């Protein structure tokens with residue numbers, strides 16, 4: 577089984593290639609990491625295993641989901657360290673994903689009912705609905721196009737949040753630039769209609785993620801900085817005329833950052849939509865460093881990816897909700913448990929969160 581061969585993710589020696597994908601569960605009430613988050617990640621942590629924390633707020637204007645954890649306040653830092661300590665006690669590596677929803681927000685999630693910030697003024701079309709705090713579905717409002725000065729302030733919110741994660745004891749951070757959110761609103765030409773230095777050509781549309789990654793690299797070190805992208809996912813109107821060209825464009829900037837800094841990044845996380853599809857390998861071939869593949873991967877598919885050189889690590893999401901011991905279940909080929917979509921974003925600390933049985 578090549579999924580349980582040791583891999584060196586920079587200064588982090590992992591015992592296997594099974595990675596917990598970042599998964600918003602909406603259990604951090606009032607944007608505060610609750611104690612149930614510790615029990616949730618401890619059920620999933622293994623010795624030498626890599627865990628990726630769910631999307632975490634970098635600013636009071638970064639949320640588009642109910643009860644999502646933050647890392648911009650001291651109170652959230654002292655609540656994150658209590659969970660990082662329990663995960664570190666099991667000998668696991670944990671990364672905190674910095675998440676900014678951009679235009680995928682709502683007045684109920686913004687302070688004083690302000691409009692969500694984005695690269696453009698176009699809102700998400702009406703075929704997508706945002707989850708409301710009361711369980712219903714609302715309408716994505718019209719965002720507000722920010723200038724270059726506000727862009728640098730959001731970049732600083734990434735840098736300040738990256739340092740708070742290391743203060744909380746995290747082994748590193750992952751830049752969430754996928755799934756049609758703030759960073760993905762700049763990369764995809766279907767959303768970025770700007771005429772300044774942040775829109776138009778591939779070089780201009782890659783400037784925001786380059787400044788975001790370069791800021792967190794110079795603050796906490798490149799080897800503790802992860803990057804997640806999704807050039808082919810069209811979620812929340814995140815369409816690109818040439819997804820393969822944009823993926824290679826993002827990789828080129830990531831390689832240039834690794835060369836000018838004299839150090840390698842932690843990894844490059846690429847997730848794909850649920851379905852040839854040779855875009856995953858093509859992006860792996862262009863990137864110089866660790867590659868994590870994501871999107872509809874199973875036990876045989878993950879083993880096939882590592883054995884064929886398609887990826888170094890394989891991250892699993894949905895199966896990690898209903899299988900806390902998914903790492904061990906993959907080893908023994910044990911049957912996996914089914915997951916309940918209804919309890920994906922509920923607020924109960926046990927029901928559909930930690931009540932999933934072990935093997």
Ligand SMILES: Cc1cc2nc3c(=O)[nH]c(=O)nc-3n(C[C@H](O)[C@H](O)[C@H](O)COP(=O)(O)O)c2cc1C
Nearest residue numbers: 597598599600631847870871872873892893894920
């Ligand atoms: C309930 C749920 C929450 C998710 N939250 C996040 C998130 O916070 N950040 C992120 O980058 N992806 C998030 N995702 C996307 C997962 O990474 C996605 O499931 C993964 O790319 C595909 O893995 P899978 O085939 O095992 O389901 C979420 C997905 C689900 C279903």
